[PDB]
Design a protein around this ligand. Structure first.
Ligand SMILES: CCCCCCCCCCCCCCCCCC(=O)OC[C@H](COP(=O)(O)OCCN)OC(=O)CCCCCCCCCCCCCCCCC
Ligand SMILES: CCCCCCCCCCCCCCCCCC(=O)OC[C@H](COP(=O)(O)OCCN)OC(=O)CCCCCCCCCCCCCCCCC
Ligand SMILES: CCCCCCCCCCCCCCCCCC(=O)OC[C@H](COP(=O)(O)OCCN)OC(=O)CCCCCCCCCCCCCCCCC
Ligand SMILES: CCCCCCCCCCCCCCCCCC(=O)OC[C@H](COP(=O)(O)OCCN)OC(=O)CCCCCCCCCCCCCCCCC
Ligand SMILES: [Cl-]
Lengths: 176, 100, 485, 320, 106
């Protein structure tokens, strides 16, 4: 459990850094999937068996698939932005990095001053979560369907193509 | 046993890394990718807290969070498609016509 | 708690709007019909407004651990339903010129309204988190409904990315609050802390990260840079909803949170909220002083109006008029905003591409659209807070709550901010009666649907004036709508 | 034997049995590849070793000693990872399959959820193969195949929710013990049909193979692959069929529960029937159009799975 | 119990051997055997929509999975709640099919 938490916790931080600093979009997504698998191990180490599985079933097996689909559809990668590698230029990342560092320091300070009896790791099952979802949190599940419906309707409205054909040519203003 | 503080620090590191990514990258794709790291880190914190208190509420909040991430990434990537189809450019700096 | 038959009556508004979302979607499935689908949406939203009567007769009750139905919930539910019916009446004339799928607009307005009703009854952090996303995700599509317009796409991309970032700060903050509390209910946030121990570092940090998310949605400095760009890019019908429903729905849940949460009476949070209010009041008016775009001007205006409301929140744990002030102020802001944004919608309908957003377009409105100019004048005076308008009665409440709470720096800001505001509000008002010989103005549509929008902005102006001279009726209703403490 | 302890041997015999299961599964998948090719020939009315059994060994030697090749302009990491995912996805999912009482690599609480986790990651093999290949036509074929998979991966889990509902658990052993009296093939018949359709689609087997048939601008996500890397995809498919077949036995056919023969024999017997049932299907089934497969997954299977679960719930709560 | 510890080690070894076996076969192919000395276009968003629809429906299925393992404990109230959820899902599916968003051929 302890090894799993620290090893997976470290695999995640290292992979996440590779993602934000990578030039190749697909490689960045690969390191992002690696970090999601690492976070799934952290979830399992803490006893969150349901969250654990969902981390791989929905986040690294659906949301990420959609991202790869888009990168492969628009043939992303090798763009002037990813060729200039501006993010690597120190004058571009030093400022943002310092703001993030100060935010982390302040947050960590607050965390270090909290009561900590420790996380036992007793497994919380998906059955227990389901009893809660269809018991005290019933309105959440019903309204969550409406939220996903809104995503479906909006994504279709702005994501639908006006030009028919599996292969389309990139025209300015998508002129037909 | 894992110290609750250690779990919360892991989430904070992944949150600040995701934010740094959203600000240093001009590509809309890397900005959307950075947001996924931030929302995953917030969901991880809820699971850590729910595990410390031994409650299913942490995992229930995680499910609501991943549901938003799925819906937000869906709409987010749809706008990326529209921008690419009309401007063949993902530099967010170019999407800055309205100002002042 | 479980869902008893009695609990189900208190959910009528949420259940009716939800059923409307389904029936309208099944109607679009059967056959796209702009008139029928718009009509079905309006009928469902009205039915929900009428159901509020039955909810009130039933009485205050906590349906589940996530929702508490009381007078406050009914009042804010009514406000969101009114601002949403208006959005629909303003959309039909505009969507008539939209040569593309138009039934989905109403479908999204309904789901966003569901978010506001949830936020009105929200008594749990999960409800707060879900309600904001139910009122934000539909708006991403509404702000970018005319994706073919460059400004509308820019507005949608800006709102989506910034709202997503704001949702992560909110969730992370709620997670840190949970790590210290162990309960996600508002009444438990700060309850476990002992005497003099309320300022627990992590509890304060969680609230601080939650404020970044809530402050963004309420366009409060320093999370306000998005307001002018999104308000201008979003289609005019949508701008009306973003300026009214979202702000009122989210400001209300924040009031309930700082009222029920024990940590709400933290001086550190109060002093931080006070700096945000002062900046929002001064920065909003100063940035709107030189605006030549009415949409951007009304954006900066929202920044200041929300700053005025925050003063009542800062004086919440010191008096009882605080809740009454916000109710009266938000009622006035609703009618005043529906009036100004609605006139912009009618002058931008039918959709012909870019909206009439330049102040030059309104430089002789009276000599073409007399009643529309008169309404805009009344709303400009109301938003300025000029006695004889409901806007002033809202400002009076804020100043009274502030004085009773000795918020002298904030009361001084309201006076300086209002003085700065008079310059731009009056400029837009007097402009309507100037003579613009240049007439590139488009002819008004001639259908009862367009005339209905004109009635909405007219009735809203009449209410702003009648309640501006005789406010006791409204004061009595808002006083009945009190949270179940 | 000084270090040997009664507990250590238990933690050693268990590891040995897990390795045995892994080897037997990989062997079965490879053998089926040959067994099929031959049976298909018999159906078409048409050797290296014993009945051609050594043909499998011959192919492996050739593929191992074949010049390994990664396209000069191909992402080596993604190009090399694709075959790996195809081979080590459903193979890992076999860890939850109880082959006999006392023989299960992992008795996990998530149980069936682990198969769904691995099935979800399998899609990346197709996507990575297409993108890394650097062949524009391969990319289109990969995207077509990937869209087809997602159209069947959508109801894959929901097809098994009726079985989970009756068992009240995701644990496979609990699911088997719950078929003691009636196998779930009878009560959850629609689930069995839908799961079979989704399972073969996930394994990219007939008739969900060749999703690039209609498009002339599509070739396949295996065009640039050669040698072992090409073989890893082929073997992965058959290992996946074995895993699916063993899941159907465990989920709809009572697993190792049989009247007289030894428990393991039943498991094998039933699994072999399913492995050969797919073979009968391959020959006796005309490939439908890409449009038909896409539509069938979203308009027929997905609704049916959602309805089966609701009806199963009503019957369960009624009987209680 | 030694049983759970034994199963933990067995699962780990199975996973390590499985991935190790794949690497062995791949590295063998690379070593064994000799070797010769030696933008304008895009794919339709119809591919994205299918993936986006999959994501939405897959996340919706998560709730039904949690209900499935707890149908008896949730009772008839839970059935009524799930029924409403499944109906909304089917209603959206009907909408997608009727608007033609689910027909690959134009
Ligand atoms: C490179 C890969 C690195 C992977 C590191 C993490 C795995 C380390 C090896 C397994 C550790 C297992 C362990 O410590 O024991 C099982 C543990 C607790 O099991 P339990 O039954 O609750 O208690 C038994 C007595 N302690 O179980 C747990 O609490 C942890 C369960 C999940 C273990 C990890 C799951 C896979 C993670 C893959 C990450 C891939 C990243 C790329
Ligand atoms: C007769 C049947 C057929 C007709 C149906 C009705 C038709 C109209 C429907 C639309 C409007 C409905 C508004 C209903 C308000 C009255 C609700 C009510 O029952 O009021 C009393 C209620 C407390 O009732 P109870 O708990 O039974 O009292 C026990 C005392 N021992 O106390 C409350 O709950 C307080 C209610 C007032 C505050 C909330 C108001 C919400 C609605 C308005 C929102 C907008 C506000 C701004 C309006 C500005 C107008 C200029
Ligand atoms: C651009 C213009 C903006 C103007 C903004 C306001 C400017 C004035 C700010 C005054 C600040 C407070 C000064 C006095 C110290 C704090 C208050 C105090 O000690 O008493 C407050 C007074 C009495 O009540 P208190 O003492 O709180 O309670 C016990 C009563 N036995 O109860 C009170 O509330 C009286 C406070 C003093 C009078 C305040 C009203 C001043 C009106 C405007 C004057 C402008 C010119 C100067
Ligand atoms: C990397 C190689 C090592 C991976 C981990 C091996 C050890 C796993 C283990 O010990 O499982 C821990 C846990 C036990 O779960 P269970 O057997 O149901 O017992 C419940 C009461 N403790 O079971 C779990 O929570 C683990 C379930 C998920 C395992 C994921 C394995 C990797 C999947 C992705 C591969 C790519
Ligand atoms: Cl007029």
């Amino acid at each position: 459990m302890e090894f799993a938490f620290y090893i997976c916790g470290l695999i995640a931080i290292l992979a996440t850094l590779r993602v934000i600093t990578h030039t190749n979009p697909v490689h960045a997504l690969l390191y992002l999937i690696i970090s999601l698998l690492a976070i799934s191990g952290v979830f399992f180490s803490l006893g969150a068996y349901f969250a654990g599985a969902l981390e791989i079933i929905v986040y690294a097996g659906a949301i990420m698939v959609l991202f790869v689909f888009v990168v492969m559809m628009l043939n992303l990668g090798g763009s002037e932005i990813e060729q200039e590698r501006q993010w690597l230029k120190p004058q571009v990342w030093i400022g943002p990095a310092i703001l993030s560092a100060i935010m982390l320091v302040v947050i960590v300070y607050a965390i270090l001053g909290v009561n900590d009896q420790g996380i036992d790791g007793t497994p919380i099952s998906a059955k227990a979560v389901g009893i809660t979802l269809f018991g005290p949190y019933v309105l959440a599940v019903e309204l969550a369907s409406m939220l996903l419906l809104a995503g479906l309707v909006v994504a279709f409205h702005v994501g639908r193509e006006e030009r028919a054909g599996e292969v389309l040519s990139n025209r300015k203003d998508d002129s037909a | 046993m894992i110290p609750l503080q250690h779990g919360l620090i892991l989430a904070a590191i992944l949150f600040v890394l995701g934010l740094t990514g959203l600000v240093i990258r001009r590509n809309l794709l890397f900005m959307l990718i950075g947001l996924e790291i931030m929302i995953n880190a917030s969901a991880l914190a809820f699971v850590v807290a729910g595990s410390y208190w031994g409650q299913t509420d942490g995992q229930v909040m995680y499910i609501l969070a991943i549901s938003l991430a799925a819906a937000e990434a869906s709409i987010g990537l749809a706008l990326l498609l529209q921008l690419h189809r009309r401007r063949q450019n993902l530099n967010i700096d170019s999407v800055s016509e309205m100002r002042g | 708690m479980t869902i008893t038959p009695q609990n189900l009556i208190a959910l009528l508004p949420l259940l009716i709007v939800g059923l409307t979302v389904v029936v309208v979607m099944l109607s679009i499935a059967w056959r796209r019909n702009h008139f029928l689908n718009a009509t079905l949406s309006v009928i469902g939203l009205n039915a929900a407004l009428v159901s509020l009567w039955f909810v009130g007769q039933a009485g205050a009750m906590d349906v589940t651990p996530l929702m508490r139905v009381d007078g406050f919930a009914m009042l804010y539910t009514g406000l969101v339903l009114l601002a949403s019916l208006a959005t629909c009446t303003f959309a039909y004339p505009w969507l008539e010129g939209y040569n593309d799928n138009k039934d989905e607009f109403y479908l999204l307005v309904l789901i966003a309204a569901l978010g506001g009703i949830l936020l009105a009854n929200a008594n749990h952090l999960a409800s707060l988190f879900l309600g904001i996303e139910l009122i934000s995700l539909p708006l991403f599509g509404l702000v970018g409904y005319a994706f073919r317009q460059k400004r509308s796409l820019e507005a949608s991309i800006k709102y989506t990315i910034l709202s997503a970032a704001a949702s992560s700060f909110l969730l992370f903050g709620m997670a840190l609050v949970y790590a210290q509390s162990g309960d996600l209910s508002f009444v438990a946030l700060g309850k476990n802390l002992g005497d003099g121990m309320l300022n627990e570092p992590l509890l304060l940090a969680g609230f601080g990260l939650m404020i970044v998310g809530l402050g963004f949605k309420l366009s409060l400095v320093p999370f306000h840079l998005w307001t002018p760009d999104v308000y201008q890019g979003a289609p005019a019908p949508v701008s009306t909803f973003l300026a009214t429903a979202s702000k009122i729905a989210i400001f209300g849940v924040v009031m309930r949170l700082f009222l029920y949460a024990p940590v709400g009476d933290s001086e550190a949070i109060r002093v931080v909220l006070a700096i945000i209010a002062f900046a929002s009041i001064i920065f909003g008016n100063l940035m709107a002083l030189s605006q030549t775009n009415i949409k951007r001007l009304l954006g900066y205006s929202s920044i200041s109006h929300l700053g005025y409301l925050l003063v009542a929140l800062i004086a919440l744990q010191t008096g009882e008029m605080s809740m009454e002030a916000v109710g009266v102020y938000l009622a006035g802001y609703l009618f005043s905003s529906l009036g100004a944004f609605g006139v912009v919608s009618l002058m931008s309908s039918p959709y012909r591409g870019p909206d009439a957003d330049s102040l030059f377009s309104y430089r002789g409105l009276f000599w073409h659209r007399p009643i529309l100019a008169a309404v805009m004048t009344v709303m400009m005076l109301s938003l300025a807070g000029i006695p004889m308008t409901l806007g002033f009665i809202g400002k009076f409440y804020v100043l009274a709550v502030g004085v009773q709470a000795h918020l002298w720096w904030l009361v001084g800001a309201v006076v300086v901010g209002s003085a700065i505001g008079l310059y731009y509000y009056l400029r837009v008002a007097v402009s309507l009666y100037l003579h613009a010989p240049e007439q590139p103005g488009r002819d008004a549509p001639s259908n009862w649907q367009y005339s209905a929008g004109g009635i909405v902005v007219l009735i809203s102006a009449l209410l702003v004036l009648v309640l501006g001279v005789w406010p006791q009726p409204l004061i009595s209703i808002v006083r009945l709508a009190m949270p179940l403490m | 034997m000084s270090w040997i302890s009664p507990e250590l041997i238990e933690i050693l015999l268990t590891i040995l049995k897990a390795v045995v299961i892994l080897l037997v599964v990989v062997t079965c998948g490879a053998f089926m590849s040959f067994g099929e090719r031959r049976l298909l020939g018999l159906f078409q009315n048409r050797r290296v070793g014993w009945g051609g059994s050594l043909q499998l060994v011959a192919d492996m030697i050739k593929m191992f000693f074949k010049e390994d090749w990664i396209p000069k302009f191909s992402d080596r990491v993604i190009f090399t990872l694709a075959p790996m995912i195809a081979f080590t996805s459903l193979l890992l999912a076999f860890a939850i399959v109880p082959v006999s009482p006392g023989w299960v690599v992992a008795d996990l609480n998530i149980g069936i959820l682990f198969f769904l986790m691995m099935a979800g990651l399998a899609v990346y093999a197709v996507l990575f193969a297409g993108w890394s290949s650097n062949n524009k036509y391969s990319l289109l074929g990969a995207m077509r195949a990937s869209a087809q998979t997602l159209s069947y991966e959508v109801f894959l889990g929901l097809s098994l929710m009726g079985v989970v509902a009756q068992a009240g658990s995701f644990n496979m052993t609990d699911i088997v013990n719950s078929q003691a009296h009636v196998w779930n093939v009878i009560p959850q018949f629609f689930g069995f049909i839908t799961f079979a359709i989704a399972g073969v689609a996930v394994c990219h087997r007939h008739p969900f193979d060749q999703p690039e048939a209609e498009q002339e601008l599509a070739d396949g996500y295996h065009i640039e692959y050669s040698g072992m890397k090409f073989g890893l995809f082929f073997v992965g498919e058959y290992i996946g069929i074995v895993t699916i077949s063993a899941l159907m036995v465990t989920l709809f056919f009572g697993g190792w529960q049989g009247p007289l023969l030894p428990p393991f024999i039943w498991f094998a017997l039933k699994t072999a029937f399913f492995m050969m049932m797919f073979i009968l299907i391959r020959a006796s089934l005309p490939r439908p159009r890409y449009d038909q497969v896409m539509s069938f997954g979203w308009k027929i299977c997905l609704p049916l799975t959602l309805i089966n679960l609701l009806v199963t719930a009503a019957v369960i709560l009624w009987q209680a | 119990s030694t049983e759970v510890i034994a199963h933990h080690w067995a699962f780990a070894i199975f996973l390590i051997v499985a991935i190790g076996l794949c690497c062995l076969m791949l590295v063998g192919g690379w070593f064994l055997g000799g070797r010769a000395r030696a933008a304008r276009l895009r794919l339709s968003a119809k591919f994205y929509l299918v993936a986006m629809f999959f994501v939405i429906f897959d996340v919706e299925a998560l709730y039904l999975f949690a209900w499935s393992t707890s149908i008896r404990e949730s009772g008839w109230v839970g059935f009524v709640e799930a029924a409403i959820f499944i109906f909304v899902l089917l209603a959206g599916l009907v909408y997608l099919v009727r608007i033609g968003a689910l027909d690959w051929t134009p």
